[PDB]
Amino acid sequence: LSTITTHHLTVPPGLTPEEFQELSSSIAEFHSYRINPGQCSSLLAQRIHAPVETVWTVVRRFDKPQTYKHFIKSCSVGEDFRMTVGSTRDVTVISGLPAATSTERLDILDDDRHVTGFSIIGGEHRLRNYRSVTTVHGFERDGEIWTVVLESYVVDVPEGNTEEDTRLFADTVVKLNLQKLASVTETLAREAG
Numbered sequence: 001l002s003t004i005t006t007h008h009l010t011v012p013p014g015l016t017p018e019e020f021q022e023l024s025s026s027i028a029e030f031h032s033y034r035i036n037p038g039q040c041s042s043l044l045a046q047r048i049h050a051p052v053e054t055v056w057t058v059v060r061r062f063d064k065p066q067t068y069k070h071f072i073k074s075c076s077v078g079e080d081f082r083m084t085v086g087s088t089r090d091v092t093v094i095s096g097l098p099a100a101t102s103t104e105r106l107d108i109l110d111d112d113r114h115v116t117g118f119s120i121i122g123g124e125h126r127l128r129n130y131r132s133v134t135t136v137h138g139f140e141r142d143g144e145i146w147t148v149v150l151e152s153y154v155v156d157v158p159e160g161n162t163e164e165d166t167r168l169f170a171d172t173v174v175k176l177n178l179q180k181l182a183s184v185t186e187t188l189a190r191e192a193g
């Protein structure tokens, strides 16, 4: 039947076992899902050499995903947009012709614990029931500071497609965007001001 995910029981690539052991409780709390046989799920991680709040400032900007995501032609939130749970954005994604479109709902926004997440609720694409959660975590060792970003998703595997291809597609999109997040925020952190 329906199973529970095991992301919180395995070390994701781009993370040390030591980092994982510090995060296992957060991964269980924020990055676990009950999924059905038609579904798949994944957890991705990205180490960033920047302070938490520098990374969180970018991560939390629901109305501006283009700041850290690839292939975003536009993101409209209308007027008068306030950042509250339930608010939506219309993203236009230029990774093909015609451009894919996605209407996405802000599911979570916790500025204290640095948790956010969204659900895809419309548009033209093949990621039915896509939902993701992103958490941001600070690390310290001998006065040195860095950040780990964790991002997990659940999504329906579209008819005609394998779970492997579905996971490869979504994993690559999320991974490459976490890479852009790392570049953008490390640049911010490096230049300060």
Ligand SMILES: CC1=CC(=O)CC(C)(C)[C@@]1(O)/C=C/C(C)=C\C(=O)O
Binding pocket: 069, 071, 093, 095, 100, 101, 102, 120, 125, 126, 127, 132, 170, 173, 174
């Ligand atoms: C890049 C792109 C191609 C598609 O066909 C679907 C969709 C338009 C939703 C998407 O924006 C996918 C976005 C994903 C998986 C994650 C995200 O944005 O956090």
